[PDB]
């Protein structure tokens, strides 16, 4: 129904035989190609289910936060998607405690407001040390609390690139009652994710295509244009 299979050409390429046998129903015989290869029909069905759920959630003002922490490609991806659609985002991964309670988020947003509206009148009046401290505090807030400045209630949804390397937030979400949608190839615990996406993120092109697809999925909620949902073209771009 969406994203015809002719555009998915390099959807595999995960690590060699280092996985979790909690999966397997989504995987074809492993020892036949020495790589984690997925079945594409169930892939498209899961993608359609994820699209349906995210559009249902966002239709009623469901705000989402991206999870982008890997080295180079996902950084630019999350930057582009966050600057395109008015949603919160995470630059560097959580240190714990920034998602389990709102009071810390409240003092963080208060610090951000005070800092910006005070540094608006303090840039060269005193020594370079205090101005540099103000700039460093701004940059630190961008590093950790950069995207969390437009929310008054706890985030109702979040999209994760992989449960590994982001275990803290997903564990809190298991503790919490918030639904979870995430990417996972085979190195996950499927119990911790409620909307499984068996889409491999090893190849950058597939990650870019899926991220743009989800951005367009959340785009229709706020009445903003869509770019790559039914387009008969696959995103091809040499790794930077």
């Amino acid at each position: 129904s969406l994203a015809k299979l002719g555009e998915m050409r390099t959807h595999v390429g995960m690590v060699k035989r280092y996985w979790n046998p909690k999966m397997g129903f989504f995987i074809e015989p492993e020892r036949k190609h020495n790589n984690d290869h997925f079945v594409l029909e169930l892939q498209r069905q899961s993608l359609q289910t994820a699209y349906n759920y995210v559009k249902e959630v966002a239709q009623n003002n469901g705000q989402i936060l991206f999870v982008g922490t890997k080295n180079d490609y996902v950084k630019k991806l999350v930057n582009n998607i966050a600057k395109r659609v008015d949603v919160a985002f995470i630059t560097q991964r959580w240190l714990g405690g920034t998602l389990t309670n709102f009071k810390t988020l409240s003092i963080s947003i208060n610090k951000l407001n005070k800092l910006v509206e005070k540094q608006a009148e303090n840039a060269a009046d005193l020594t370079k040390k205090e101005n540099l401290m103000l700039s460093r505090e701004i940059e630190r807030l961008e590093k950790f609390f950069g995207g969390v400045k437009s929310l008054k209630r706890l985030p109702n949804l979040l999209i994760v690139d992989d449960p590994v390397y982001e275990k803290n937030a997903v564990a809190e979400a298991n503790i919490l009652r918030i639904p979870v949608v995430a990417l996972c190839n085979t190195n996950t615990n499927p119990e911790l994710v409620d909307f499984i996406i068996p889409a491999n993120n090893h190849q950058p092109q597939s990650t870019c295509l899926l991220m743009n697809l989800l951005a367009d999925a959340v785009a229709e909620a706020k009445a903003m244009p869509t770019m790559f949902a039914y387009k008969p073209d696959e995103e091809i771009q040499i790794e930077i």
């Binding site: 349906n52 759920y53 249902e56 959630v57 009623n60 469901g62 109702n156 949804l157 639904p179």
Partner: peptide, 5 residues
């Protein structure tokens, strides 16, 4: 289920 309200 869907439609998280």
């Amino acid at each position: 289920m869907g439609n998280f309200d």
